[PDB]
Design a protein around this ligand. Structure first.
Ligand code: LY5
Lengths: 491, 151
């Protein structure tokens, strides 16, 4: 029947195997072909070209070859310089360029033949800040890997002048093994609240260093910028009590999406996994779920343009593709439920600025969902006969252990003036109670350096006790922090 | 060539390499300059740059030099000057993303030295800048670094 060809350009170092992106591309095409609801009468074909990383010259040549073979779109390469070069070519010949990865948008750049399936930085930036504010952090250390990290967090970096966040900015070194000296400074600095802006492979690496450093405990809370957080081996850390929170755009809760991610692991996990990585083997990363979603969203557009056919275009000549303008318009208007949730582009710039994120945190069970985020709602986090606990302290003759012939259990082990008072109060006011001897053997004073209380006063402040029944002197400093009865003895 | 047309920059660079040239004083702006640099690298003709663009570490091109004073050094000299004026408070105002990068040395200082610092962004047009300046005024931000073009 009817046939349409897509182009693919995938970046790599050394040689095979195939990478995640080129794999998801092929996988999406094979799947769609077999779907009888999507492109029923249409059968997708493709040319794939492999190039070196950062060789924009080679990327240009391969894109020109593909436009010569004839293609309806180029799922151009990932990295900034090659991607900008294929985008300029695609714009001159009016063939849609489909991107899956963020690159810096220059304002005065007029290219219009591209869409990008990657969740725009502006929106992610805001959702980081939204999360920080929900945890009520007033202090936070942002740690980034390379320059462009800065740009992904600009919304956050500019907050300290509107809201009340003091914030320290540090940079990782090239290698995470070099990161102890940096972590030691944060430790001395008491920087317990930390955002890591970096790849998920960097994050796996920096966590190991953080463990070594005594920094994976209940005292530390780490927010992760990476969307591939869910790919991290979390077995070394879930028992420790650290808090790890981040985001996930891969819609794993949907059953249809889980089954697709599985069939992927079978053809992929079948090939090289690593031991010392700290990543789960055969998890579908975001770079690849996006490519697979891009092939679908573009196909939804092809369904609405049966007239369209490929033309052999030459980079030599300034003659664009007849159907380009109309196809590009259909793609930008397209809507699709894919591996990464609602797909919808921005009328204005063709960037994916509106999308849905699950919000995930480390519980002892593993990484689990604790809410959602979307740009229009912010966070949607999904959150009398009692005995009184009486704190007291041994002090003659107020509270002592009773000497008795009879067996004594529980509260009846104690006697004294304060015990007699407690018994009367419990009868008059009608409560039951449990007597507990205070853990530090103190009445209650405030530390002159850190301002923390101890003794029975601290038990009350922290609501660990209901009552302190003891010869607790009523003083100015104490009455400011607890509520005393009127005195039962004056002296 | 047009600004930001890396495709046209590629074509013109190829024409020139065809005429024969000992070096291309390639174009100024990031995307066209990166494209002419990749071409120049494949054909081993020196590409001479005059403007800063972001250096990617894992990029292996070797046939270029850049006459623009590197950002790392300028960053330090800004910080050196701030410290000589003994400022402990400063508001950095930048125009566009890449401004951030030129001041990274300065932005990372508040954890080593004793500088509290506030980071604000200019709007597209400076005529729109009164509301921003009013906040700085109320804020008593008397010490200010402007990272932006001379225009
Ligand atoms: O609330 C308090 O801090 C005190 C503790 C406790 C203090 C004792 C008296 N002090 C115990 C002491 F021996 F340590 C010295 C003596 C005193 O200062 O005269 C009497 C019963 C108590 C009255 N309230």
């Amino acid at each position: 029947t009817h046939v349409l060809r897509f182009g693919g350009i995938f970046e790599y170092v050394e040689s095979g195997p195939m990478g995640a992106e080129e794999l998801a591309f092929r996988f999406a095409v094979n799947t769609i072909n077999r779907n009888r609801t999507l492109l029923p009468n249409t059968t997708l074909t493709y040319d794939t070209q492999k190039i070196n990383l950062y060789d924009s010259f080679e990327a240009s040549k391969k894109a020109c070859d593909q436009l010569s073979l004839g293609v309806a779109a180029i799922f151009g390469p990932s990295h900034s310089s090659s991607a900008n070069a294929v985008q300029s070519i695609c714009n001159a010949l009016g063939v849609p360029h489909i991107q899956t990865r963020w690159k810096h948008q220059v304002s005065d750049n007029k290219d219009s033949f591209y869409v990008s399936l990657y969740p725009d930085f502006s929106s992610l930036s805001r959702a980081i800040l939204d999360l920080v504010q929900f945890f009520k952090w007033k202090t936070v250390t942002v740690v980034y890997d390379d320059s462009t990290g800065l740009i992904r967090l600009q919304e956050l970096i500019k907050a300290p002048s509107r809201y009340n966040l003091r914030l320290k900015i540090r940079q990782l070194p090239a290698d995470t093994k070099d990161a102890k000296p940096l972590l030691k400074e944060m430790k001395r600095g008491k920087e317990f609240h930390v955002i890591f802006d970096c790849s998920h492979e960097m994050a796996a690496g920096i966590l190991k260093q953080a463990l070594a450093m005594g920094m994976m405990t209940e005292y530390y809370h780490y927010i992760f910028t990476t969307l591939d957080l869910f790919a991290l081996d979390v077995e070394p850390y879930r028992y420790s009590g650290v808090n790890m929170t981040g985001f996930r755009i891969l819609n794993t809760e949907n059953t249809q999406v889980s089954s697709i991610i599985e069939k992927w692991s079978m053809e992929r996990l079948q090939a090289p996994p690593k031991p010392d990585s700290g990543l789960l083997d055969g998890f579908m990363t975001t770079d690849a779920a996006l490519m697979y979603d891009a092939v679908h969203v573009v196909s939804v557009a092809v369904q609405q343009f049966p007239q369209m056919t490929v033309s052999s275009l030459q980079c030599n000549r300034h003659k664009p593709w007849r159907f380009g303008t109309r196809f590009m318009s259909l793609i930008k208007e397209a809507h699709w439920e894919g591996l990464t949730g609602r797909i919808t582009f921005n009328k204005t710039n063709g960037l994916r600025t509106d999308f849905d994120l699950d919000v995930i945190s480390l519980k002892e069970e593993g990484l689990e969902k604790i809410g959602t985020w979307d740009p229009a709602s912010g966070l949607n986090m999904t959150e009398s006969n009692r005995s009184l606990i009486v704190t007291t302290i041994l002090e003659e003759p107020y509270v002592l252990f009773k000497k008795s012939d009879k067996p004594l259990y529980g509260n009846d082990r104690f006697e004294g003036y304060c015990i007699d008072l407690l018994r009367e109060l419990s009868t008059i006011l009608g409560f039951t109670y449990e007597i507990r001897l205070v853990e530090d053997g103190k009445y209650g004073a405030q530390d002159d350096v850190n301002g923390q209380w101890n003794g029975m006063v601290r038990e009350l402040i922290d609501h660990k006790a209901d009552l302190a029944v003891a010869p607790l002197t009523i003083t100015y400093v104490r009455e400011k922090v607890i509520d005393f009865s009127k005195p039962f003895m004056t002296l």
